[PDB]
Subunit: 305 residues, 4 copies
Amino acid sequence: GHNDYKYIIHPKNRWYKAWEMFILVWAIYSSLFTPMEFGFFRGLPERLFVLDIVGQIAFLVDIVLQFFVAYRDTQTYRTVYKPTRIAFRYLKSHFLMDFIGCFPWDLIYKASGKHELVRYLLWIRLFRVRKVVEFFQRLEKDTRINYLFTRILKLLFVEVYCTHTAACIFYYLATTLPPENEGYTWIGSLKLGDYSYENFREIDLWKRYTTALYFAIVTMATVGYGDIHAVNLREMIFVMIYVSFDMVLGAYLIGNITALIVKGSNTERFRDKMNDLISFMNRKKLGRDLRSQITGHVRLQYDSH
Amino acid sequence: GHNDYKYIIHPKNRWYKAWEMFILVWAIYSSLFTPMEFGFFRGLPERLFVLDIVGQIAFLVDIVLQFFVAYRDTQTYRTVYKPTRIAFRYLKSHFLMDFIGCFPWDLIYKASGKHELVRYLLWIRLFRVRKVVEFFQRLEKDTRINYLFTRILKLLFVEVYCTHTAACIFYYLATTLPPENEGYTWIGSLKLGDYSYENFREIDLWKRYTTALYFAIVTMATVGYGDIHAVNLREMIFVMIYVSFDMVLGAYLIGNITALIVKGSNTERFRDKMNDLISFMNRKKLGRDLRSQITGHVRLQYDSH
Amino acid sequence: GHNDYKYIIHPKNRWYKAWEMFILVWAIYSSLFTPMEFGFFRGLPERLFVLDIVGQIAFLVDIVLQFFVAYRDTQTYRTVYKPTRIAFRYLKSHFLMDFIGCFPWDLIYKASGKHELVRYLLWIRLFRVRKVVEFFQRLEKDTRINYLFTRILKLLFVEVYCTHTAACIFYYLATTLPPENEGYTWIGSLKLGDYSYENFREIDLWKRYTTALYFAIVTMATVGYGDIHAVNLREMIFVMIYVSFDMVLGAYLIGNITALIVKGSNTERFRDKMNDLISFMNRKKLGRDLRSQITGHVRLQYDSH
Amino acid sequence: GHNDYKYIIHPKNRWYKAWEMFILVWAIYSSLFTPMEFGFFRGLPERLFVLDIVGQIAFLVDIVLQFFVAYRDTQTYRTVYKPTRIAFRYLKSHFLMDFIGCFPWDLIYKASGKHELVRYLLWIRLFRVRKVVEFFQRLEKDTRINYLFTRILKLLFVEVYCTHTAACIFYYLATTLPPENEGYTWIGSLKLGDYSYENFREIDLWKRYTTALYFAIVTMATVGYGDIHAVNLREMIFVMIYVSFDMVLGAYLIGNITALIVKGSNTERFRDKMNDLISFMNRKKLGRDLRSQITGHVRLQYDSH
């Protein structure tokens, strides 16, 4: 019903759904790479320079594309296709964060005399998780999948993101101290087996990330070996914040899993009904013939709904 | 006849709800600073003197103000303005503890030749958490702030209070040994990174508090890296008490969160019914028109009942 | 209701109930001390020799008492008064483990050439925890206390008792190595702070017990600091067993706490009713006078049942 | 149709049930020993040469009998005794994996010049855990044992299997490094007590396995002492994978146990009502005779009316 608004793309268009999946994949990488770019590099190496610029370009198109995309209203509950209303809705809803996230923050950091506060603007690109939140909302609205399983998946994804981000921030806090005071950081004072993470800034990127993620994963599960631990006061405060948040997050995970199991399965509804029928049967002693007939018939009833 | 017993403050009038919020903030600060004044300060410094005095002054005003504020008597559900009943209720319920908490315990301890037992009286000021409990009761009665979140917010407040108090008591137990025996304390033997907490009484207040709070949060979160751990026998006993209490309290937090997720939402029960009916509809394929009719009928139960 | 059998005691007599409480206290003490006698001493020191004797006497009397105490039948629900039936039921229910527990196992251990296997018969006195089990059964039968709260209390007692027993067994396993191989034990290699548990068998009893209980409590909450950890293979096996059992025990504690919170409070039931009524009035836009009347009258209904 | 084609065994035949129980034990042993044979042996010693071969024999026979035993249809709900029908079921469902697992993979590894990738094929024998899965499925459809309790037993078996397999893989990852780099492995740098695991390949098999299983068990319960921990990057990655999976699995264990407790019992449901009735009756101070009448009437209801 938008013959007048021919330019506007239907949100259920097949090609726009393909673009939604493509930009969902791009958003996952961007919101996972951004913490690593901010934590393990003080300026992106040239080898992945293109991966920076291209990474924003795919999002820039989205900024344009979302301007030519209709939507379903929340008060009228009618699918609104007015291009001016579309533009105003996206300008006042999410345009600012998406647009500011596509700035060449690495190039701006390197051009502006290597100022760290400029690099702190990379965290705007964590607002690209809005794509994943929208994907999980859509998949929760999907009646095919169980609703509480969707919540469990969303919580596990949040745990993955928070653990990865916590690892990147934990390594970054070690980098916030000068290398001379590196012995007062968690990684600069770290010694695992024979290996000593002495000049940790010059260790391979993936060794550093694996160590930080190992600490973050081990803390997230509340195992807590101690091999890696906070040493600074800043590391101290960050670990307190992270474990306090992850305590509530793990409690929510346990609660959601328990709610899924408490909901019960038809198999269980059938098992309980079986036990009730057996109680009745043994309290009236029907007889093996009628007993077996009843059991078989009710099994077939539960099987055939 | 409010004019008869004038100058009696109605419980829920303006300018007394503002004072209730003001004294709530003071109660939170006093009930959080008290553990720190006791654990990290054998003697409060001149720098804090005025602040300390000011705190008691506020609560002193509270003691006066609560002698004039009317109350709803639960056996008649009216608001009694008679000053004798107000004073009698204050004297019976909680006046002695409130009054004792307002004593200049810090100055009294100093003016008594620095007797540690006088400084244990500071713990009376932890009864000011009755204001936080009252605020949480009122918030629970509130409908806008749903009982849903507030039930676990109360437990998170309890977690924060207990962790902070445990950190303060842990540091205090470290101080209960003489400094020459400081190598047998948890902090005196601490060598986090290249920094050793050699003379821990001369370390900055905030580094010591951050260390103790990190241990307490680490223990509460059940991570237990062990970088920081009990060393004294008194430290073992305190850690055992705190650990058992925190196991029970964390189980309570998980149980409260699980119950909020199990209770579920009207939408959620509607989504259960919709999932069942959509599964049956796909199994017994019946067309979009009958689908629409039955789904609209179902949607006229979650929104009509 | 027994003329012929005058020598039989009702299990409701205030004298027998007082003796039941007295022997419950004695059984709690004996079940708690038996592990300590086995783990921290290769033979009881003379100082508490009398305590070894009189306590057994305290249970020996009970062995006699249950031979002429009436018992309520299961199916008939009639308190059987026949001394022959009472004696036979006691003889085949718990007489053997009570009588074996009442033997002077310390004196028998010392007389039989200090043969270590004789001291393993001390574990028969673990069966005196049946009095605590029966106490909790009666408590859960009592209506003055919530059933699920009684289950939580039973689980907490089980956790406490298993932690204490695990601490005693851990120390015992340390003592199962010769004092020359003590460097391979968990406590003989312990260097908490500047204190070293070198000659750990000559350390003060409460110092050793507090250390073992600290390890057991810290493992029980799964804090797991690491300061104290299994070193032997036998210590490793015991830690695996205790950890695996404690995992299920903690899961059961969480489940029971959740179940109680899920069962819900009348306050929460009212909060949900109030939310439903407020939704109704908001939909129908009832005037503030009538809405306030409805709210107040519903509060009074809930308070006055 | 059991007369038309002979040599066909009824699925619930007594001899076939005995063979099912026998091959269940064999499958449990095989799927528990396969991780141990993979991780702790780079080639099975000849001391076990018979024990592996016989094992495969036990499953080879199990492959043959699977070509004769009948099955109950999911469509016609009736047993089919037809060799052509029987063979197709096996050939499609599980023949291929069972046959590959029956191969002498140790002999093939030793006859192929000791290639480790050949030894990786032992993990096919982990599909014999399908026998345990089928046994638990049959146990679920049994009135003697609760459904949710069967589920928690399944999850406890899953925890046992996953912990043992994780221990074996953890040791194997240490062996993937050359012995000269053993100081970088988790076990090669282990110095528990006064014992150092220097030449960890020459340590007794059961000492190494007990150490690895200790680590895996303490991390499964999230105790995380720290004494044993990952050192290589491969060790960190495996610990992260195992720790995340075990976080989810422990949350599932807690959820299953909590659902079993929340489900409740008819007795517990009765106690809930009877507690309410006792509160009401004590509130109104009702007569004992009418109390007995009401309590008996309610006891009638909570008896599966």
